[PDB]
Scaffold this active site. Structure first.
Site, mmCIF file in Angstrom:
data_model
loop_
_atom_site.group_PDB
_atom_site.id
_atom_site.type_symbol
_atom_site.label_atom_id
_atom_site.label_comp_id
_atom_site.label_asym_id
_atom_site.label_seq_id
_atom_site.Cartn_x
_atom_site.Cartn_y
_atom_site.Cartn_z
ATOM 1 N N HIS A 61 57.815 -11.565 13.369
ATOM 2 C CA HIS A 61 57.398 -12.578 13.566
ATOM 3 C C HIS A 61 58.817 -13.817 13.259
ATOM 4 O O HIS A 61 58.641 -15.382 13.022
ATOM 5 C CB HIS A 61 56.989 -12.409 11.370
ATOM 6 C CG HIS A 61 56.935 -11.485 10.939
ATOM 7 N ND1 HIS A 61 55.327 -11.347 10.703
ATOM 8 C CD2 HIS A 61 56.930 -9.992 10.722
ATOM 9 C CE1 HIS A 61 55.343 -10.459 10.320
ATOM 10 N NE2 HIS A 61 55.900 -9.906 9.987
ATOM 11 N N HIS A 91 68.214 -17.141 11.396
ATOM 12 C CA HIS A 91 67.190 -17.187 12.469
ATOM 13 C C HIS A 91 66.004 -18.473 12.106
ATOM 14 O O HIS A 91 67.214 -19.302 11.763
ATOM 15 C CB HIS A 91 65.238 -16.188 11.393
ATOM 16 C CG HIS A 91 65.216 -16.639 10.429
ATOM 17 N ND1 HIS A 91 66.062 -16.182 8.655
ATOM 18 C CD2 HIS A 91 64.620 -16.986 9.418
ATOM 19 C CE1 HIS A 91 65.529 -15.957 7.731
ATOM 20 N NE2 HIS A 91 64.577 -17.118 8.517
ATOM 21 N N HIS A 93 62.245 -20.989 12.673
ATOM 22 C CA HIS A 93 61.051 -21.293 12.508
ATOM 23 C C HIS A 93 60.780 -22.007 12.887
ATOM 24 O O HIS A 93 61.455 -23.623 13.684
ATOM 25 C CB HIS A 93 60.850 -21.667 10.903
ATOM 26 C CG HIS A 93 60.499 -21.019 10.395
ATOM 27 N ND1 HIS A 93 60.522 -19.266 9.026
ATOM 28 C CD2 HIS A 93 62.147 -20.327 9.333
ATOM 29 C CE1 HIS A 93 60.935 -19.067 9.058
ATOM 30 N NE2 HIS A 93 62.327 -19.513 9.058
ATOM 31 N N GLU A 103 60.008 -26.129 8.650
ATOM 32 C CA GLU A 103 59.670 -25.033 7.072
ATOM 33 C C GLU A 103 59.508 -26.308 6.224
ATOM 34 O O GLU A 103 58.157 -26.595 5.407
ATOM 35 C CB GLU A 103 60.312 -24.130 6.826
ATOM 36 C CG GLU A 103 59.968 -22.810 7.806
ATOM 37 C CD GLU A 103 59.378 -21.429 7.032
ATOM 38 O OE1 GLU A 103 60.695 -21.529 6.477
ATOM 39 O OE2 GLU A 103 58.227 -21.210 7.137
ATOM 40 N N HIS A 116 68.620 -20.729 9.733
ATOM 41 C CA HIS A 116 68.285 -20.342 8.373
ATOM 42 C C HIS A 116 68.932 -19.502 8.304
ATOM 43 O O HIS A 116 68.873 -18.118 9.191
ATOM 44 C CB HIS A 116 66.828 -19.891 7.389
ATOM 45 C CG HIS A 116 65.986 -20.661 6.970
ATOM 46 N ND1 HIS A 116 64.596 -20.649 7.228
ATOM 47 C CD2 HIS A 116 65.365 -22.207 6.892
ATOM 48 C CE1 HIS A 116 64.033 -21.609 6.674
ATOM 49 N NE2 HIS A 116 64.506 -22.696 6.777
ATOM 50 N N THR A 195 60.453 -17.612 2.198
ATOM 51 C CA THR A 195 59.319 -18.119 3.050
ATOM 52 C C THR A 195 58.677 -16.977 3.627
ATOM 53 O O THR A 195 57.315 -17.982 4.247
ATOM 54 C CB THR A 195 59.383 -19.029 3.841
ATOM 55 O OG1 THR A 195 59.953 -18.869 4.683
ATOM 56 C CG2 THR A 195 60.666 -20.534 3.263
ATOM 57 N N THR A 196 59.101 -15.911 3.839
ATOM 58 C CA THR A 196 57.699 -15.036 4.022
ATOM 59 C C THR A 196 57.488 -14.152 3.390
ATOM 60 O O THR A 196 59.091 -14.033 2.339
ATOM 61 C CB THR A 196 58.477 -14.433 5.622
ATOM 62 O OG1 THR A 196 59.945 -13.421 5.029
ATOM 63 C CG2 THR A 196 58.725 -15.574 6.754
HETATM 64 C C1 LIG Z 1 64.237 -6.943 4.369
HETATM 65 C C2 LIG Z 1 64.350 -7.150 2.819
HETATM 66 C C3 LIG Z 1 62.927 -8.582 2.705
HETATM 67 C C4 LIG Z 1 62.899 -9.534 3.196
HETATM 68 C C5 LIG Z 1 63.891 -10.501 3.450
HETATM 69 C C6 LIG Z 1 65.114 -10.422 3.776
HETATM 70 C C7 LIG Z 1 66.154 -10.631 3.412
HETATM 71 C C8 LIG Z 1 66.104 -12.064 4.256
HETATM 72 C C9 LIG Z 1 64.977 -12.967 4.162
HETATM 73 C C10 LIG Z 1 64.701 -14.266 4.746
HETATM 74 C C11 LIG Z 1 63.471 -14.545 4.790
HETATM 75 O O1 LIG Z 1 63.245 -15.774 5.501
HETATM 76 S S1 LIG Z 1 63.617 -17.376 4.658
HETATM 77 N N1 LIG Z 1 62.503 -18.846 5.353
HETATM 78 O O2 LIG Z 1 64.690 -17.065 4.951
HETATM 79 O O3 LIG Z 1 63.566 -16.784 3.275
HETATM 80 C C12 LIG Z 1 62.235 -13.873 4.575
HETATM 81 C C13 LIG Z 1 62.904 -12.056 4.285
HETATM 82 C C14 LIG Z 1 64.153 -11.835 4.083
HETATM 83 C C15 LIG Z 1 65.825 -8.629 2.807
HETATM 84 C C16 LIG Z 1 66.363 -8.682 1.697
HETATM 85 C C17 LIG Z 1 66.380 -6.875 1.331
HETATM 86 C C18 LIG Z 1 64.525 -6.799 1.867
HETATM 87 O O4 LIG Z 1 64.269 -5.607 2.430
HETATM 88 S S2 LIG Z 1 63.325 -4.313 0.976
HETATM 89 N N2 LIG Z 1 62.317 -5.047 -0.006
HETATM 90 O O5 LIG Z 1 65.207 -4.380 -0.065
HETATM 91 O O6 LIG Z 1 63.843 -2.509 1.024
HETATM 92 ZN ZN LIG Z 2 63.261 -18.578 7.879
#
Ligand SMILES: C[C@]12CCc3c(ccc4cc(OS(N)(=O)=O)ccc34)[C@H]1CC[C@@H]2OS(N)(=O)=O
Ligand SMILES: [Zn+2]
EC number: 4.2.1.1
Length: 257
Positions: A61, A91, A93, A103, A116, A195-196
């Site tokens: 993504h 990362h 967008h 965004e 970001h 945001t995802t």
């Molecule tokens: C992999 C994870 C889930 C998603 C995620 C994470 C970190 C930063 C992220 C930034 C994003 O983007 S944004 N635009 O900055 O908001 C979108 C998703 C992100 C980790 C945090 C632990 C989760 O892993 S887990 N559920 O514990 O197995």
């Molecule tokens: Zn982002």
């Protein structure tokens, strides 16, 4: 699964992630005339001199650059934050055209891309715990406008050829993220979400007022990445941004008059 297409895009995410319709979702439009100057906000403190980048990765993504967060090497403090936040990854967008891609928006203006820088609160011990907390993450958001080239970005641009499709990764050491920052650290801030998916409501957003410029040739290189894995039908990675969400019961504060 979820993505940015017609049949799995942001308007569908609530079916698997009901918090998509929650009270503090991101991104938002920043109305500059109703944001409130808050003189009690501290300056941001960005200590990136000891940052250790590790790998660059196409995750299907976006692409992300990961950092060693096993110690306090690259940290964010100050501003609206209490405590120390370690840099985990950054990362982008971006859009299919220069008039869209960011965004967050500023008075409904869309930028060509948004950077970001993701940090997590060290009091929770690991990023997995932090995402379960209302103050677990702080994301620094930087707008990209198309104009002059940004020299500190070129090393990222030149390696994208080697992570074209989903799942590819490459070594990416000795990258200094300070080359991506604008001159001013004036910011807006509001409590928000990822945001995802999983769209967790764990983020203090810090959105910088001053955009960075990048050249058309630099951003065109973003648009040549692929959502698909190798050997699959080719779908260009463009427009990987979530549209603005309702502000609801939230105030955006500004660090500057
Ligand atoms: C992999 C994870 C889930 C998603 C995620 C994470 C970190 C930063 C992220 C930034 C994003 O983007 S944004 N635009 O900055 O908001 C979108 C998703 C992100 C980790 C945090 C632990 C989760 O892993 S887990 N559920 O514990 O197995
Ligand atoms: Zn982002």
């Amino acid at each position: 699964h979820w993505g940015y297409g017609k049949h799995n895009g942001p308007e569908h995410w609530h079916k698997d992630f009901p918090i998509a319709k929650g009270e503090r979702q991101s991104p938002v439009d920043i109305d500059t005339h109703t944001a409130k100057y808050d003189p009690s906000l501290k300056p941001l403190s960005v200590s990136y001199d000891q940052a250790t980048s590790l790998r660059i990765l196409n995750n299907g993504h976006s692409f992300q650059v990961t950092f060693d967060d096993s110690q306090d090497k690259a940290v964010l403090k100050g501003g609206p934050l209490d405590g120390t936040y370690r840099l985990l990854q950054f990362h982008f967008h971006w859009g299919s055209l220069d008039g869209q891609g960011s965004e967050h928006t500023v008075d409904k203006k869309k930028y060509a891309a948004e950077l970001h820088l993701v940090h997590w609160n060290t009091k929770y011990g690991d990023v997995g715990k932090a995402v379960q907390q209302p103050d677990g993450l702080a994301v620094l958001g930087i707008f990209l406008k198309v104009g002059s080239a940004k020299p500190g970005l070129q090393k990222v641009v030149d390696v994208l050829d080697s992570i074209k499709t989903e799942g590819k990764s490459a070594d990416f050491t000795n990258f200094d993220p300070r080359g991506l920052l604008p001159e001013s650290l004036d910011y807006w801030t509001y409590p928000g979400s990822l945001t995802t998916p999983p769209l967790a409501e764990c983020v203090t957003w810090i959105v910088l007022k001053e955009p960075i410029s990048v050249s058309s040739e630099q951003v065109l290189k973003f648009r040549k990445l692929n959502f698909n894995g190798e050997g699959e039908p080719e779908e260009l990675m463009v427009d990987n941004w979530r549209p603005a969400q309702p502000l609801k019961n939230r105030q955006i504060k500004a660090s500057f008059k």
